[PDB]
Amino acid sequence: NTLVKQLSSNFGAISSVLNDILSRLDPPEAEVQIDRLITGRLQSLQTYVTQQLIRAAEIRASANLAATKMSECVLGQSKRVDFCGKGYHLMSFPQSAPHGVVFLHVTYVPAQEKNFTTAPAICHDGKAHFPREGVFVSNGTHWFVTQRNFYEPQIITTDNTFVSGNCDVVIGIVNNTVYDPLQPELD
Amino acid sequence: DVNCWRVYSTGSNVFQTRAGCLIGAEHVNNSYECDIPIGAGICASYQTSQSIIAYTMSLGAENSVAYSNNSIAIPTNFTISVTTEILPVSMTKTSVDCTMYICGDSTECSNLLLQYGSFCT
Amino acid sequence: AIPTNFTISVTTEILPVSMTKTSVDCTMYICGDSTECSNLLLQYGSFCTQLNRALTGIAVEQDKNTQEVFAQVKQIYKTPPIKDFGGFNFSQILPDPSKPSKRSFIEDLLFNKVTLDLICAQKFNGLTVLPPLLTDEMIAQYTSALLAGTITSGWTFGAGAALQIPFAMQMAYRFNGIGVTQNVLYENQKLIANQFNSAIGKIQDSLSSTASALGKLQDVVNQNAQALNTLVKQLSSNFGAISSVLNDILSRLDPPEAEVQIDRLITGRLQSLQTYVTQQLIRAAEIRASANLAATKMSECVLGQSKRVDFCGKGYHLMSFPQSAPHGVVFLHVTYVPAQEKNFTTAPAICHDGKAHFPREGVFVSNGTHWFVTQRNFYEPQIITTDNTFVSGNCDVVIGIVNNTVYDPLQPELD
Ligand SMILES: *[C@@H]1O[C@H](CO)[C@@H](O[C@@H]2O[C@H](CO)[C@@H](O)[C@H](O)[C@H]2NC(C)=O)[C@H](O)[C@H]1NC(C)=O
Ligand SMILES: *[C@@H]1O[C@H](CO)[C@@H](O[C@@H]2O[C@H](CO)[C@@H](O)[C@H](O)[C@H]2NC(C)=O)[C@H](O)[C@H]1NC(C)=O
Ligand SMILES: *[C@@H]1O[C@H](CO)[C@@H](O[C@@H]2O[C@H](CO)[C@@H](O)[C@H](O)[C@H]2NC(C)=O)[C@H](O)[C@H]1NC(C)=O
Ligand SMILES: *[C@@H]1O[C@H](CO)[C@@H](O[C@@H]2O[C@H](CO)[C@@H](O)[C@H](O)[C@H]2NC(C)=O)[C@H](O)[C@H]1NC(C)=O
Ligand SMILES: *[C@@H]1O[C@H](CO)[C@@H](O[C@@H]2O[C@H](CO)[C@@H](O)[C@H](O)[C@H]2NC(C)=O)[C@H](O)[C@H]1NC(C)=O
Ligand SMILES: *[C@@H]1O[C@H](CO)[C@@H](O[C@@H]2O[C@H](CO)[C@@H](O)[C@H](O)[C@H]2NC(C)=O)[C@H](O)[C@H]1NC(C)=O
Ligand SMILES: *[C@@H]1O[C@H](CO)[C@@H](O[C@@H]2O[C@H](CO)[C@@H](O)[C@H](O)[C@H]2NC(C)=O)[C@H](O)[C@H]1NC(C)=O
Ligand SMILES: *[C@@H]1O[C@H](CO)[C@@H](O[C@@H]2O[C@H](CO)[C@@H](O)[C@H](O)[C@H]2NC(C)=O)[C@H](O)[C@H]1NC(C)=O
Ligand SMILES: *[C@@H]1O[C@H](CO)[C@@H](O)[C@H](O)[C@H]1NC(C)=O
Ligand SMILES: *[C@@H]1O[C@H](CO)[C@@H](O)[C@H](O)[C@H]1NC(C)=O
Ligand SMILES: *[C@@H]1O[C@H](CO)[C@@H](O)[C@H](O)[C@H]1NC(C)=O
Ligand SMILES: *[C@@H]1O[C@H](CO)[C@@H](O)[C@H](O)[C@H]1NC(C)=O
Ligand SMILES: *[C@@H]1O[C@H](CO)[C@@H](O)[C@H](O)[C@H]1NC(C)=O
């Protein structure tokens, strides 16, 4: 709109209508007037073209980002944090909009939480026990092992841990028992 | 860039900030979230009386996690959420014309423009 | 080749986030203070109204870049008075409540190492500088909140609620994600703590001995000043007229003859202003791209652990900490690197009872008389049993299989 409205400026000439100039003057004294209008209009065209060229690069960069998001968040599962919405990512759905794209990210978010007391390792018979997968927890009277992102207590067994070295080298080890499920079946 | 002194239409409720002298906006001492920016950590919004409120931005609530050396927190329940994002992909395609714009339908103007080089190809 | 020892390193990264916000004013710049000059300018339709609408568009983005990079926490976390982090020592980067501008020591060194009337010179010509929306105290608070999040909540606080966990177990989890089992960490607690403390101590000495890396953060500022100076100096050229003084031309010639000199001066000054604004527009894009890259690094390397190689430091990434610097950000990456390698002879598989055994984890090695299986990134021999391998077919198709014996612990127990 600004570019099209620029056509009305006198640019230091008699009138902004070219037919008025070439209906009132003889060409030897009309060319010098027409030159100013030509110069001004050419400058305005240059400015508009430069602005469009500048904006195109930004739009192309945004388009490339959208392409990467489409390739990663949709055609698969991405473990990059905050690249497919807040929280952990599960899936995405694309939608089309006039001159744009809309992404629907589905995310999984942990809701509640509880207090617990934990220890890094367990010493049973002079050997330190470590959790194969998960973490040790204890509600003050018993000890269980549970997965990281959910509450699901289980009994400590030799099929759920692994041994390494001897205790008294770990900073905060605590002592307890281990089930060893094979023993009752042996008898 | 004036300091409160020189005014031309002043009533009351004159306030001084780091971004200039503010006239017409009431000043309070309770923080909120920024709605209409002003600057230098000052934001203004139209909350309740019926006047304009000017205040300092609040970054949010403050909490301190009950940290320890043998205490842990485990979730017991979860939630599914859905979020939306909007991204532009293109804009309007346009095209102009050399002679139709600069010279219109005139014939002498085109010959005069030929004096210039290739400034429109 | 197998490593047998490891080293913790700390690396730094510097990124510019934003630049100073300026604004012009044509009527007091091109025309100074005159009536005829403004009347002549009125013939050019809507140039300066467009220029002032573009410069404010540039300026408004500088207050959004910092918000996109730093404001990524919905709360404000506070470090506890308890300072038993298993041996680690964050005293150099935690906020110090001893000065009114509460900042950490390294932030103070960063501020002192960057050195910024010019404003009155602009006021001669209507040029002005606008202050940023977020004051430096707010940025310091944001950085303190982000740093306190990772100390006492691991990386859970960035994806929901904040859950506390002792620092030792968090570091053990972080090693678990780079291919080293947990039992290494608890057997080297003091050794890791001392190395981390010494690495942190080295950084301040490096920055206190005239570091040449901060120049990248400095350079941009210099450039702006340079360009701005050029603009003012442009006013001291006659552009082919009699003189560059506006009032002198009106004071020594008739108006119908002075109008042409006025027009020449107007054209020259307008062209100079256009060139300056185009330069500003060009530079804004580079700064914005750098800001977006910094935001991506902040979201990935800090609020979590990234398995991308050479994106959060050189080596296997462990964590990172942010620091605020004048118009920029500084990242401290903590990294794990193997140290001393030893030779071994390997073999793909083992077949014992006519069936090939493949290792369920790690790799088969042998010192020359006996065979062990060990995890890939650290030397730790174990006896080959049926809890470490799995069977697949008969040994006739593997290229380099070799005889050996598998323990099978159940049989001694049942005996
Ligand atoms: C901690 O949780 C355990 C697991 O349920 C509780 O132990 C059980 O308690 C019930 C009754 O409270 C008994 O009937 C079970 O026999 C117990 N199981 C075992 C393996 O002993 C324990 O009571 C909880 N402690 C606290 C303080 O809440
Ligand atoms: C956990 O319990 C074991 C016993 O099963 C403790 O081992 C003994 O502890 C006593 C006193 O703490 C020592 O005098 C003995 O020398 C230890 N060894 C034995 C009896 O073989 C172990 O110390 C306990 N760990 C704790 C309390 O952290
Ligand atoms: C803004 O205006 C106030 C109002 O005068 C200034 O306060 C004066 O400061 C000067 C020098 O500091 C003193 O000599 C006057 O006595 C002060 N007068 C009053 C009424 O306070 C204030 O200094 C100005 N702002 C700045 C940055 O100079
Ligand atoms: C886990 O959270 C869900 C949703 O917050 C709980 O499901 C709700 O349970 C209540 C029972 O008190 C019902 O009245 C609601 O209708 C349930 N919600 C829905 C969407 O069906 C669920 O009970 C929670 N689980 C536990 C163990 O607390
Ligand atoms: C792994 O490297 C560390 C140092 O990088 C070794 O610890 C050093 O051990 C020597 C003993 O010869 C001491 O004099 C040094 O003071 C120790 N360094 C530190 C920082 O305490 C460690 O021994 C190496 N591990 C192995 C198995 O060689
Ligand atoms: C953690 O690091 C700080 C920083 O070096 C230690 O504080 C230093 O303590 C020594 C004596 O122990 C003093 O000579 C230094 O002047 C202190 N420096 C500072 C900056 O305060 C601190 O001792 C370390 N350990 C703990 C537990 O904080
Ligand atoms: C390769 O490693 C094995 C396992 O440790 C070494 O065998 C041990 O050697 C020592 C010293 O000769 C004996 O005390 C042990 O009884 C041996 N154990 C077994 C299971 O054989 C062997 O010596 C090592 N070979 C070389 C060349 O270093
Ligand atoms: C595993 O050991 C056997 C030896 O028992 C190696 O080859 C066999 O050798 C015996 C006599 O020495 C022959 O009767 C068998 O026919 C051989 N087996 C085959 C498949 O030809 C066998 O090469 C060893 N595997 C290795 C070295 O990878
Ligand atoms: C866990 O215990 C601490 C101990 O003071 C307490 O501050 C915190 O609120 C507790 N957490 C919950 C979820 O109640
Ligand atoms: C944890 O801190 C308490 C102090 O409240 C201390 O008595 C205990 O020994 C500490 N435990 C570890 C493993 O550092
Ligand atoms: C705001 O400033 C006034 C002026 O001193 C003061 O009386 C008032 O207590 C302040 N507001 C609050 C909430 O303290
Ligand atoms: C492994 O053996 C090769 C050849 O004997 C030798 O060049 C190399 O230095 C050895 N590795 C180490 C760590 O010494
Ligand atoms: C390994 O190379 C040696 C000679 O370099 C050769 O004798 C042997 O058969 C090769 N083994 C395998 C499994 O390629």
Numbering used by the authors:
A (entry chain A): 960 to 1146
B (entry chain A): 614 to 617, 633 to 676, 689 to 761
C (entry chain C): 713 to 828, 848 to 1146
Quote the paper.
To establish the structural basis for SARS-CoV-2 neutralization by a biliverdin-sensitive antibody, we imaged single particles of the viral spike in complex with P008_056 antigen binding fragment (Fab). P008_056 binds the spike at the side of the NTD β-sandwich fold, which undergoes profound conformational rearrangements. Access to the epitope is gated by a solvent-exposed loop composed of predominantly hydrophilic residues (“gate,” SARS-CoV-2 spike residues 174 to 188). To allow P008_056 binding, the loop swings out of the way, with a backbone displacement in the middle of the loop of ~15 Å. Thus, when bound, the metabolite appears to act as a wedge that restricts gate opening. Antibody binding is additionally complemented by an upward movement of a β-hairpin (“lip,” SARS-CoV-2 residues 143 to 155), which overlays a cluster of aromatic residues. Accompanied by profound conformational changes in the NTD, antibody binding requires relocation of the gating loop, which folds into the cleft vacated by the metabolite. Access to the tetrapyrrole-sensitive epitope is gated by a flexible loop on the distal face of the NTD. Our results indicate that SARS-CoV-2 spike NTD harbors a dominant epitope, access to which can be controlled by an allosteric mechanism that is regulated through recruitment of a metabolite.
